[PDB]
Amino acid sequence: AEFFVLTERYRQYRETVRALRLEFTLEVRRKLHEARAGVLAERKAQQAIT
Amino acid sequence: EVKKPAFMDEEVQRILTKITGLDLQKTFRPAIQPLKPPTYKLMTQAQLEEATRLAVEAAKVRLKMPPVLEERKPINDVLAEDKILEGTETNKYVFTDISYNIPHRERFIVVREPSGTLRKASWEERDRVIQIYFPKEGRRVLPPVIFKDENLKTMYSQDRHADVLNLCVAQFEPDSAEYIKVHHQTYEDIDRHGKYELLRSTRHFGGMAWYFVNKKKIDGLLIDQIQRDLVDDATSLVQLYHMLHPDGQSAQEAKEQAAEGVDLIKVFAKTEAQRGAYIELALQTYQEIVTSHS
Amino acid sequence: IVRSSVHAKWVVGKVIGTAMIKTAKVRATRLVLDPYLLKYFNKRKTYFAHDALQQCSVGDIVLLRALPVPRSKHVKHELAEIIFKVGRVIDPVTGKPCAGTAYLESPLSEPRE
Amino acid sequence: RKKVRPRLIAELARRVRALREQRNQPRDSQLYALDYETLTRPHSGRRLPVRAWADVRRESRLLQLLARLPLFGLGRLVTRKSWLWQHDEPCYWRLTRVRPDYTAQNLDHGRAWGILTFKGKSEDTAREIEQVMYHDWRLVPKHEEEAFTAFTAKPEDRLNSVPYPPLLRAMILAERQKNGDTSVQEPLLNLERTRMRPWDYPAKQETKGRAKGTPV
Amino acid sequence: KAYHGGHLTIRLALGGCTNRPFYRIVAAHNKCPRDGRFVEQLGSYDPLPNSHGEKLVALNLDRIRHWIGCGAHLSKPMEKLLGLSGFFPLHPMMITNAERLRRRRAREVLLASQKAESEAKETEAS
Amino acid sequence: PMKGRFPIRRTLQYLGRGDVVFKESVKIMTVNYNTYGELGEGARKFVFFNIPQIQYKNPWVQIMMFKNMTPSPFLRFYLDSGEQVLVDVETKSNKEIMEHIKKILGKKEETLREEELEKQQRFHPGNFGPRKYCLRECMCEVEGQVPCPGLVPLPKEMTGKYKAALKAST
RNA sequence: UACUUAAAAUUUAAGGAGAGGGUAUCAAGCACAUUAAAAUAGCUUAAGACACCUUGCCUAGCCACACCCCCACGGGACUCAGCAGUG
Ligand code: FES
Ligand SMILES: [K+]
Numbered sequence A: 001a002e003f004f005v006l007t008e009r010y011r012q013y014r015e016t017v018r019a020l021r022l023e024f025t026l027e028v029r030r031k032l033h034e035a036r037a038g039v040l041a042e043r044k045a046q047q048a049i050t
Numbered sequence B: 001e002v003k004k005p006a007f008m009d010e011e012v013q014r015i016l017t018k019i020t021g022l023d024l025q026k027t028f029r030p031a032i033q034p035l036k037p038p039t040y041k042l043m044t045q046a047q048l049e050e051a052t053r054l055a056v057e058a059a060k061v062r063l064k065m066p067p068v069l070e071e072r073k074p075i076n077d078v079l080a081e082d083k084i085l086e087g088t089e090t091n092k093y094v095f096t097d098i099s100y101n102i103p104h105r106e107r108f109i110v111v112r113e114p115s116g117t118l119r120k121a122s123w124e125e126r127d128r129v130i131q132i133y134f135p136k137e138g139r140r141v142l143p144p145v146i147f148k149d150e151n152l153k154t155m156y157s158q159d160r161h162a163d164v165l166n167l168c169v170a171q172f173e174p175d176s177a178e179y180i181k182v183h184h185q186t187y188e189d190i191d192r193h194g195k196y197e198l199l200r201s202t203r204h205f206g207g208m209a210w211y212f213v214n215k216k217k218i219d220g221l222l223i224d225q226i227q228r229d230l231v232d233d234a235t236s237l238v239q240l241y242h243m244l245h246p247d248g249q250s251a252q253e254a255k256e257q258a259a260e261g262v263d264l265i266k267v268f269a270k271t272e273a274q275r276g277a278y279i280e281l282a283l284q285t286y287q288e289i290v291t292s293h294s
Numbered sequence C: 001i002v003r004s005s006v007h008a009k010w011v012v013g014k015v016i017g018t019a020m021i022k023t024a025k026v027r028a029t030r031l032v033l034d035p036y037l038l039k040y041f042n043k044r045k046t047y048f049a050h051d052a053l054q055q056c057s058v059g060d061i062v063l064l065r066a067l068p069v070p071r072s073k074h075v076k077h078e079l080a081e082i083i084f085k086v087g088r089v090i091d092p093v094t095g096k097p098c099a100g101t102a103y104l105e106s107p108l109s110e111p112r113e
Numbered sequence D: 001r002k003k004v005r006p007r008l009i010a011e012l013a014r015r016v017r018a019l020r021e022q023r024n025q026p027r028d029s030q031l032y033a034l035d036y037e038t039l040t041r042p043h044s045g046r047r048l049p050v051r052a053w054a055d056v057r058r059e060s061r062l063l064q065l066l067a068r069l070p071l072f073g074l075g076r077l078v079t080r081k082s083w084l085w086q087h088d089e090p091c092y093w094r095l096t097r098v099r100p101d102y103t104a105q106n107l108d109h110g111r112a113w114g115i116l117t118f119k120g121k122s123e124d125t126a127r128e129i130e131q132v133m134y135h136d137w138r139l140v141p142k143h144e145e146e147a148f149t150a151f152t153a154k155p156e157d158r159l160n161s162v163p164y165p166p167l168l169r170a171m172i173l174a175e176r177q178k179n180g181d182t183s184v185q186e187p188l189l190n191l192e193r194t195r196m197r198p199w200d201y202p203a204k205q206e207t208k209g210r211a212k213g214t215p216v
Numbered sequence E: 001k002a003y004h005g006g007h008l009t010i011r012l013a014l015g016g017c018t019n020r021p022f023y024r025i026v027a028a029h030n031k032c033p034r035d036g037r038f039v040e041q042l043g044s045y046d047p048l049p050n051s052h053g054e055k056l057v058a059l060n061l062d063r064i065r066h067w068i069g070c071g072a073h074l075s076k077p078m079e080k081l082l083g084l085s086g087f088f089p090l091h092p093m094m095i096t097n098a099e100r101l102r103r104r105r106a107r108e109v110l111l112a113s114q115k116a117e118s119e120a121k122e123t124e125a126s
Numbered sequence F: 001p002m003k004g005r006f007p008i009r010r011t012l013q014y015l016g017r018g019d020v021v022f023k024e025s026v027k028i029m030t031v032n033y034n035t036y037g038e039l040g041e042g043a044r045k046f047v048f049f050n051i052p053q054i055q056y057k058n059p060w061v062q063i064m065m066f067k068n069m070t071p072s073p074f075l076r077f078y079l080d081s082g083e084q085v086l087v088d089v090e091t092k093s094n095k096e097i098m099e100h101i102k103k104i105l106g107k108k109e110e111t112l113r114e115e116e117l118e119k120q121q122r123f124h125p126g127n128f129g130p131r132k133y134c135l136r137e138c139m140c141e142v143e144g145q146v147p148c149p150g151l152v153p154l155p156k157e158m159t160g161k162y163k164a165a166l167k168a169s170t
Numbered sequence G: 001u002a003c004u005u006a007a008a009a010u011u012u013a014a015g016g017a018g019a020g021g022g023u024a025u026c027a028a029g030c031a032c033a034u035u036a037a038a039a040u041a042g043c044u045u046a047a048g049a050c051a052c053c054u055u056g057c058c059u060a061g062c063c064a065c066a067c068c069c070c071c072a073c074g075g076g077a078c079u080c081a082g083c084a085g086u087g
């Protein structure tokens, strides 16, 4: 009775934690792209040349 | 509705800055701190006047008044109630988000209680833990013992009110109950003993006069300003009292008679002064001295 | 068209030798702070540069460009420009030939020769 | 520097050692031989776990079944006793290629390839089969294939979205109010993109390690 | 040391003195020593109740999310801390252990009641 | 007595007074000046007083100086793109020369402040560790927390020595 | 750890702005260069080459070593420089 209940708890827990790791993985890449090629990034580059 | 004046309103700060005053000798009184050998510069009268101007600019930034705020409201929010964890822990956990670039009033500080309730940290818990991880020079993690009524009375006997307030600003938040309690206790002791001069040319004078105006007890400050020949300041105080209490009998009387200058103070005595008889006596004596001598 | 790894992408120096074929030995100098004295002195380095046309002479100031791939063990730069030719300097400010602190051709004149 | 001298012996040893390994590679008949009296592998003297003892004596290996079939049972279906006990839905491999170990005197060790159908869902490509040396395989009879492989999928009932953790939900709603987005929508996690396979799902045999050829 | 293989992990590094434990939450390559080379410090854990009776956990939730987004594993004690905070769901064994404790205290209460009933029989005997 | 003329030039405070921090494009600054003359006095003072300050703030820029090669003094900057910025400093004070080069090829105050803040991003006051990197080594230092057993002995019931005795006693 | 294509941690290889122990009674090293018809005769060095001697350093830690023969196919005098312990 306890083995089965625990086995399902691990499956549902690990699914919830995998969804959160993916959401965190996307925030890292969004922030990186904004810094590399965001609006502010491009304007400053041309402003320096001008 | 006509907006109630605020502490930071450009008009109120003008009146409060004026009545506070400036004195480069009091504002820049020597600090009892580790010393270094003084430096010396040869300056003309033009250069010396420029340096005095810069000193007055710095004295303005030094006299910037600390905020006057309303008492914060207790934080009582329950994020979750996980009763499965009831009885599995003996002590509360306090979790603090210590990401550097968050304003301290926007940080999440939660408490997991032994019952299992996940709740937001109270104001006392928020200030204590932020001192532990973002320590501020001057502040202590636990409330100091100088703020006890017996210890505060000791500081008042020594005429150290500006320090009691300088300590209350380093330790407590402006909207905390402890902050308001200590400030309102210092202002009240100054009133009873007429020690208004202690906080002149200091950043604490505005809050003291603000407190008296809101509490309708400016009588003592007017009698004291008049006796020191600061009657332009006294008039500005009666203007601030006629600004924060527009519907008061005194404010309506000054409109009827279009009173200005010394007239405003006489109107206050007859209409709303708690001790009007004395305000006129001091005001009358001042006029006699000014007229008799000059 | 990736650039070289070497830190010295652009180096100025004096051609101290030219006895190798199509290569000029160049002495560059940089200022290094003495930590005890807090004074700057000259630290000099030797750079082999590819002189394709053998147009370099000992004593002339030159500009070297870092090669994308090192040509050999020591040849990792090429001759970008000859800033000053030895004895044949041309004033940058006015554009007239000079021989020391003097004008071989007056700047007032316009020979156009 | 320039005093870091060359190490010829070290380079010679590395190459020589690598060459011997290729020449004297062991075979499946040797690495996976077993002593059934002690349930210990002679090659390494590794004793099998206790939970595997019953099946090692009671079940067959894959190529023991396939060596008795024409063309080594290409096209036949093979299932595992562990799957039969754990999963009600059909689980089997459809054999496509089979490389027996000719060295074995009974052709009872080797490698196999096939198409996986796990819990009623079939993969689209054939890949190498793992755990071929396990005593867990059961050949499906030809006359029983139709009844065995019959499966009707049930509508999926595992939740597709779940709430956010209590603190992480409050941080999301707080950000909404700060940015001016006014809404009472409940933040929801999407679990469809990140759904986990069963723990006993067949793994990739191609990327799995093989034991070394030094006897213990 | 020059490690070959391994992954980044978020774990508790033990500090303090004897009978006075204190933990630093850190992100570190898994093969490094427990208190040795790390990549970033992500908080601290004080497991001893303070004057107010509070065990104090500090979490840099902005940097923690960054390293979980880059593949950082989590130790089981750290997964328990994130579950108690509310940042992660409660760990399966946190729930199971709480259930085991409930079943074990129910037995103790029942045994005490049976002993009291046995004591009541002694009272009846007088 | 510190040796040399104007020994103040050999103090860290003087070297740090330089205000010309070149942009990343600047790679080389050749200085052509004359040791004798009247129109090159500011250039000579620039080499004497300013070249040390410029090098201190721009350690990776090659400053190479040539003497008495041309009739007039000038400054030529070599950029990474391959552009060459020639400056003519004749009849110009050393202070004027510094201001000119600051404007054309000097980083702005805003840019320099941003770089300073980015450098310190990974220092956190809450972080515990050695004094070189952190304010506090241990949580025992914090007020209200349990003090270090070395400074203040722990209660007997909080000690493993005592707990072990009870477990044996049980 | 993600995608059918990208964020990290951790390494390896080729390098070089600058810095980096002692002895100059170690003053020359002796192929240590370039070109790319295969010729030219060069390269390093008193701004310290080369030779020898001594030393762990860069300290949230790093580097080297793992019975010996720098290595470890091989050979040999054949293993605690893991914990405790012994001569
Ligand atoms: S140094 Fe903190 S407990 Fe001893
Ligand atoms: K060795």
Ligand SMILES: [Mg+2]
Pocket (backbone or CB within 6 Å): none
């Ligand atoms: Mg397995």
Ligand SMILES: [Mg+2]
Pocket (backbone or CB within 6 Å): G025
């Ligand atoms: Mg001798």
Ligand SMILES: [Mg+2]
Pocket (backbone or CB within 6 Å): none
């Ligand atoms: Mg060895």
Ligand SMILES: [Mg+2]
Pocket (backbone or CB within 6 Å): none
């Ligand atoms: Mg030994």
Ligand SMILES: [Mg+2]
Pocket (backbone or CB within 6 Å): none
């Ligand atoms: Mg050993």
Ligand SMILES: [Mg+2]
Pocket (backbone or CB within 6 Å): G080
């Ligand atoms: Mg030992």
